[PDB]
Structure formats: structure tokens, C-alpha cells
Design a protein around this ligand. Structure first.
Ligand SMILES: *[C@@H]1O[C@H](CO)[C@@H](O)[C@H](O)[C@H]1NC(C)=O
Lengths: 212, 209, 232
């Protein structure tokens, strides 16, 4: 009844990859495929057996062999890093629609980029509201894995820290953000706060001062 | 002699995809034939043996277009293909007929006519599709009880689609009965239907038939 | 062509009734199309909910059949979804889509054995919580010299303490697109959200160009236009 597909597969840039979908309902109706990039709604890439909607590259192709549907991407490119879902209709009962688990396509070989760090001190308006938030923004780094650490003066700070997981930018690089919530007194009673971003062993550190 | 080869009279006249060549002669004295009855889509061919009598000797054969694929069918969807009719490895349909189905979820009343102004007898062919259940019927034509009417000066018949579970033949449990008539010079034939019509696309004009 | 627009509440109390609306434009609701609903729980995949025909035929997901009711209204050219006795497991992003007509038997052409959804709505986030709605506090992230890196400079907006998701940020009411990035929201300890929106800009412009970020929090019906000026 359910459609099953592997959760994750990886392909090198410019290579080809077959994403397989298997389920006992594929015999009754044809299988469709979607591409979903993070924070976006799914987009249909294949109607039926190798019929694509207007605006879908010829690199995407579909096929079927019994209860096995496949999606093939030729000349894989970094724009293709996303989730892929197969979809069909159940051939029995009242004919429910079932989705496959999804497949995370990682595209290997992309160029590596050091993290760019921008650290904003508390706004004067926020301070006058009796709160202080240090905003550390990290962008344009690949691979999208990063570890952030904060320093008050030169001592570590683990309390009041919140950080987001990396997310793809528009140029296929990753970006993240880190926050350190302070009281206006905690902020004025130190000489400097720092955001330390470690990516691929190398570390970039930005510093802001209350006195400035 | 008319060379059909791997094809039969039914396949050749309806435009069976495996009979794309061999329209051949404009006249002939006898027909050369020797395949699941020759009909891609299962059904019953009306007066097939009698049709073979008429076509075994003719002098001025011609395949023309009685209802162009466009314009002649402004409404209704005309791209219907099925796995049963396949050219090479892809789904297809008869070269001379069109499967009319949903257009924007509606099946408006059908009435189209053609006057034989070719100075010969005209052989028009059409079909009547019979779905296996009623839900599929409504999925295509949107009418629980449909009709097909073909009328001329010397022909008239109304068709009722009988919907019942049938054993799968050639992978298809639906049926299409095929029917033919001869239109005399100057005579006018009209097709009226609200569903289940395999519309004529290409007709034929001949003599001594 | 046909386009779908979702309408629904950002928040729904636990054990209450979720109700959304999908409007059809450029096409008629009374067509041979299956108007469908889909949802996506956080970090999970796609889950089909149900479908409806303009005539009234309904087919629901077996697991949700008991608490689901998809409707249609030809008066406004809309169709709707209703999910009752909601729990946190119902918190998800809900979509409306259009699916083609199909056939159960082998009487139809090949075009009626596809299944797909080609036109989708943009999605509406629905959170199931007993917490009350809170609007955002927008604070500027002003550009400075310890922030400008050459010709380009960075400025943004801090959107602090709001609930529930989502928040959408634009700049200059949509006239500033390039070099813009709005970061995923972070979930603080208090259960409130916060996110930032940054934009990259030439350093010579910030002296003579006005920069405004337009924050929108539809769950609270709040629209904040915040002027980001350089520090002085
Ligand atoms: C349908 O047929 C009518 C004639 O009966 C014609 O006027 C119309 O343009 C056709 N197409 C549509 C979309 O109505």
C-alpha cells in the first residue's frame, strides 16, 4: 500500500543518479515525482512516464518496471540538491493517494567556501527597551556544517545562546545565524563580546564593543 | 492487387497503427491478406465480411480528411491514446479515428456534418465506446446515459452504451464497436452524440463500391 | 492558468477544529479536477489528506477519515478543509492542490491513469498550541564600519519574540530583492520565535538611500515598516 524509497543518496557534480521508488500500487497508476527545496512548496517535475511539465530541465527523466518507478538526473548540478518524493494512487479500496518517504539528494564536489561573519551589537532602540541581543550572521560557506561559540571578554558563554541550522542561500551556499540574549547591564559590564565561527577546522571571529 | 502484408482489412481501413504504410493503390482487382481480428481496441466490427465484398474490387480509391483534427472539434479532447494501440513502444490510436473525451470537465452536445461533394461514394467509419463501469464513464464523458446518432439520406441509427463488467481482452475490459456506411454523391451525413463517440477523422471515397 | 491561494488560522487550540479555505482563480471549480489537500509536519514528509469533486464525491486518507471533512462552495469558487479534535501531531504546513481525473477500470485512454498534482497553493502554516498569539518586536540592525567589508555593506532587521510561525520579511515593499536573506526562525526557551533578515548593499548608497524592512505576521495581523538608518 505504501511507497518506499531510500532516504538519502549522493551524486558527484555532473554525474547521473537513479532514485528508485517501489510500492505495490505503482502497477495500477503511473508515478509522479516532485522536487522540494527547503522552505519551499513542492514542484512537480514529472507528470507520468517521462512526461515533464513546462519549465523542467531535460536532465530529469522517469521510467517504470513493474512495481518500480525511477527518477534519473543526468549531469547533476548543485541546483538539484533537494528532497524528492514519488507519488501515485492506490489501485485498490477507495483508491487513496500515497506518498513515498522522500529522498535527500546530496550533490558532492561543490566548491568549498569559508564562512563570512557579521556581528551586530544591540540596537540603541532595543537597549531602551531594557533588552540586548547580539546577532551573529554567517553566510556563504560550503559545506553547510558550522559550530559557533560565544565569548564575553575572553571567557566562554554557554547560557542565553540560540543558533539556527544552516540553510541554502540563493547562490547555493549555506547560511546560519546565532543569537546571544543579554541584559543591558550584562552588555555594558564587559569590554567585548565575540562570535567565534569554526568551519572546516578554520575559525573566523568577530568582536563588538559596548564602548564603540 | 492490394498488398496488406502483416495487416488485415479491418486494421487497414481503421488506420491501425501497425498498418501505417500500404495505403498503396488507387485501384485494385483483389486484396492480398492472410492478429487478434485486426482491431487494436476490442469490440465487434459491424458488417465486416460484407465490407470485404465491397472493397475487393474498386477503381478510384482515396483517403481524405472528413473532419480535420483541429477546428472540426473545437470542443472536446481529441488526443486520446491507449496502450492497446501502440506504434513502436508508445501508446497510440487509429490513424483515421479520434477518441473524444473530457475538455475542461464537460462534454457538450456533439453535432457535426459533412456533404459528399467528391462525385464518388464515400465510406465513413465511426465507433461507439463502452466503458466497463459507470464511474469511468462519468470520468470521460460526464453522462450516465449517452447516445450516438448517425443519420444520412439512406442510413439512420441511434446507439446506447451498455456498461457492464467484461473480461479483459488485449488488456482492455472496455469495448468499441465499429460501424460503417456508404454516403452517396451529394448526400449529407450527420453525427449527433453526447458521449462514447470515436469520432471519424479520415474517410474514404471510391467507385464500384 | 488556475492558481490556488490558501486561507486559514495561524493557530488552533488543542482538541479544537482546524478550518482552511482554498480559492481558485483563472479556472472554474466545476471541472473534472480533483481538488486535494496535503500537509507536511515539521521535519517530516508529505501526507495526503483527501480530495473532492465539484459534484461532491469525497475520498479521504484512511487514517484521517474519522476527523476530516473536505467541502466545496461554488458561490465563491472555493473549497475547504476541516480537521477536528486536533493535536500537536496535526501541527504542519497545509497545502491545497489540483489533481487530474482518473479511471478505476481499463476503459479509458492513458491520460486517465496518471496521478499528479501540478498546481499547488503556496502553503499555510498551522500550529496547534494552547499559547496565545504574540506579535513581533522589530529592531533595526544598523550598518557600521565594523560591518562594512569593502564596497558592500550589511544591514538588517531583528524580529524578536513572536508566536506562532511564520513571519515574512521584504525590503522597500518588494523593490529590494538581490543580496537579501531572511534566516530560519529560532525557537527560544520561552516558546517564542525570533529571526533576522539581512540585505547586502553598496557602502556609498547607505548615505543617500532609504532602507526599510516590511515585517508581516499574519497570525497577529501585524505589519511593521522599520527604517534602518546608519548609526551616528
Ligand atoms: C465549442 O463549440 C461552439 C459551437 O457550438 C463554439 O462557438 C466554441 O468556440 C467552441 N469552443 C468553446 C471553448 O466553447
Amino acid at each position: 500500500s505504501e511507497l518506499t524509497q531510500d532516504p538519502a543518496v549522493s551524486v558527484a557534480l555532473g554525474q547521473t543518479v537513479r532514485i528508485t521508488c517501489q510500492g505495490d500500487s505503482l502497477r495500477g497508476y503511473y508515478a509522479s515525482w516532485y522536487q522540494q527545496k527547503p522552505g519551499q512548496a513542492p514542484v512537480l517535475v514529472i507528470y507520468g512516464k517521462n512526461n515533464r511539465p513546462s519549465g523542467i530541465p531535460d536532465r530529469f527523466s522517469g521510467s517504470s518496471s513493474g512495481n518500480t518507478a525511477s527518477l534519473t538526473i543526468t549531469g547533476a548540478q548543485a541546483e538539484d540538491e533537494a528532497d524528492y518524493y514519488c507519488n501515485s494512487r492506490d489501485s485498490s479500496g477507495n483508491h487513496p493517494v500515497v506518498f513515498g518517504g522522500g529522498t535527500k539528494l546530496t550533490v558532492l564536489g561543490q566548491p568549498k567556501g569559508a564562512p563570512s561573519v557579521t556581528l551586530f551589537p544591540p540596537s540603541s532602540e532595543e537597549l531602551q527597551a531594557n533588552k540586548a541581543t547580539l546577532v551573529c550572521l554567517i553566510s556563504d560557506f560550503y559545506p553547510g556544517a558550522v559550530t559557533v561559540a560565544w565569548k564575553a571578554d575572553s571567557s566562554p558563554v554557554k547560557a542565553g545562546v540560540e543558533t539556527t541550522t544552516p540553510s541554502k542561500q540563493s547562490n547555493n551556499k549555506y547560511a546560519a545565524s546565532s543569537y546571544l540574549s543579554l541584559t543591558p547591564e550584562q552588555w555594558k559590564s564587559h569590554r567585548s563580546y565575540s562570535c567565534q565561527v569554526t568551519h572546516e577546522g578554520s575559525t573566523v571571529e568577530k568582536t563588538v564593543a559596548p564602548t564603540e | 492487387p492490394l498488398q496488406l502484408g502483416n495487416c488485415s482489412v479491418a486494421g487497414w481501413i481503421l488506420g491501425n497503427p501497425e498498418c501505417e504504410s500500404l495505403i498503396s493503390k488507387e485501384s485494385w482487382s483483389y486484396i492480398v491478406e492472410t492478429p487478434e481480428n485486426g482491431t487494436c481496441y476490442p469490440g465487434y466490427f459491424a458488417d465486416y465480411e460484407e465490407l470485404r465484398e465491397q472493397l475487393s474490387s474498386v477503381s478510384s480509391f482515396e483517403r481524405f480528411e472528413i473532419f480535420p483534427k483541429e477546428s472540426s472539434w473545437p470542443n472536446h479532447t481529441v488526443t486520446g491514446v491507449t496502450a492497446s494501440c501502440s506504434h513502436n513502444g508508445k501508446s497510440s490510436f487509429y490513424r483515421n479515428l479520434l477518441w473524444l473525451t473530457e475538455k475542461n470537465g464537460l462534454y457538450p452536445n456533439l453535432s457535426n456534418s459533412y456533404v459528399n461533394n467528391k462525385e464518388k461514394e464515400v465510406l465513413v467509419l465511426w465507433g461507439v465506446h463502452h466503458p466497463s463501469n459507470i464511474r469511468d464513464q462519468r470520468a470521460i464523458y460526464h453522462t450516465e446515459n449517452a447516445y450516438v446518432s448517425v443519420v444520412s439520406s439512406h442510413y439512420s441509427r441511434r446507439f446506447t452504451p451498455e456498461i457492464a463488467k467484461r473480461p479483459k481482452v488485449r488488456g482492455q475490459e472496455g469495448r468499441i464497436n465499429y460501424y460503417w456506411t456508404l454516403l452517396e454523391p451529394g448526400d449529407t451525413i450527420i453525427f449527433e452524440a453526447n458521449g462514447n463517440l470515436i469520432a471519424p477523422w479520415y474517410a474514404f471515397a471510391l467507385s464500384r463500391g | 492558468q488556475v492558481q490556488l491561494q490558501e486561507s486559514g488560522p495561524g493557530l488552533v487550540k488543542p482538541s479544537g477544529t482546524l478550518s482552511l479555505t482554498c480559492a481558485v482563480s483563472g479556472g472554474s471549480i466545476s471541472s473534472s479536477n480533483w481538488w486535494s489537500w496535503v500537509r507536511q509536519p515539521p521535519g517530516k514528509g508529505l501526507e495526503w489528506i483527501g480530495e473532492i469533486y465539484h459534484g461532491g464525491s469525497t475520498n479521504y486518507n484512511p487514517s484521517l477519515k474519522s476527523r476530516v471533512t473536505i467541502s466545496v462552495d461554488k458561490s465563491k469558487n472555493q473549497f475547504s478543509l476541516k480537521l477536528s479534535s486536533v493535536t500537536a501531531a496535526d501541527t504542519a504546513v497545509y497545502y491545497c492542490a489540483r489533481a487530474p481525473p482518473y479511471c478505476t477500470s481499463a476503459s479509458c485512454p492513458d491520460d486517465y491513469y496518471y496521478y499528479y498534482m501540478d498546481v499547488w497553493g503556496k502553503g499555510t502554516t498551522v500550529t496547534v498550541s494552547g499559547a496565545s498569539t504574540k506579535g513581533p518586536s522589530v529592531f533595526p540592525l544598523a550598518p557600521s564600519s565594523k560591518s562594512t567589508s569593502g564596497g558592500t555593506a550589511a544591514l538588517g532587521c531583528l524580529v524578536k519574540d513572536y508566536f506562532p510561525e511564520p513571519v515574512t520579511v521584504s525590503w522597500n515593499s518588494g523593490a529590494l530583492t538581490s543580496g537579501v536573506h531572511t534566516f530560519p526562525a529560532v525557537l527560544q526557551s520561552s516558546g517564542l520565535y525570533s529571526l533576522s533578515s539581512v540585505v547586502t548593499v553598496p557602502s556609498s548608497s547607505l548615505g543617500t538611500q532609504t532602507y526599510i524592512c516590511n515585517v508581516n505576521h499574519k497570525p497577529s495581523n501585524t505589519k511593521v515598516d522599520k527604517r534602518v538608518e546608519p548609526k551616528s
